[PDB]
Amino acid sequence: EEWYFGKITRRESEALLLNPENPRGTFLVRESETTKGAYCLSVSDFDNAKGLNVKHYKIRKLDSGGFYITSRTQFSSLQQLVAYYSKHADGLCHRLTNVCPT
Ligand SMILES: CC(=O)N[C@@H](Cc1ccc(OP(=O)(O)O)cc1)C(=O)N[C@@H](CCC(=O)O)C(=O)N[C@H](CCC1CCCCC1)C(N)=O
Numbered sequence: 460e461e462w463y464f465g466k467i468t469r470r471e472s473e474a475l476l477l478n479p480e481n482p483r484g485t486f487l488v489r490e491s492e493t494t495k496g497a498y499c500l501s502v503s504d505f506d507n508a509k510g511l512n513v514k515h516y517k518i519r520k521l522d523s524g525g526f527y528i529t530s531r532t533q534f535s536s537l538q539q540l541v542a543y544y545s546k547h548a549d550g551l552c553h554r555l556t557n558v559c560p561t
Contacts, residue, residue, distance in 0.1 A: 461558035462541055464489045469501075469515070475559050476503040476513050484556030488537060491517060498537065500528065500544075504552045514552045 464472070464487045476485055481503050491497035498518040505511055516528050518540065525533035526540055529550065534540040545555040 484553040487559040
């Protein structure tokens with residue numbers, strides 16, 4: 460239940476997002492399974508080559524500071540990241556739209 464999904468798997472994230480009900484920009488935030496201390500923004504997309512597909516963006520945190528996907532654009536928290544990208548794609552595949560249901 461969203462937007463923070465905590466310790467779900469990459470593949471489980473993907474199975475959730477890829478519900479055909481879900482529009483482009485459907486998203487969740489999870490822990491990164493593989494980088495410890497990182498988080499992950501997982502977003503549903505579409506192209507006519509791949510069809511329905513998902514992109515994953517690592518969210519790093521500086522020790523000393525803020526959260527980021529790109530290091531020139533930082534946030535003092537995860538809700539501020541999410542609020543930003545809800546208004547602007549700014550290099551993401553798509554603007555954040557629905558939170559992932561379930
Ligand atoms: C295999 C994979 O998904 N890697 C992920 C990263 C990841 C790793 C571990 C995670 O943790 P976990 O193991 O739990 O999933 C979660 C996510 C990945 O590279 N995404 C791509 C972007 C999505 C895509 O275009 O696909 C990525 O960073 N692009 C970078 C940077 C691109 C830019 C684009 C402009 C805005 C700032 C980012 C690159 N190439 O310069």
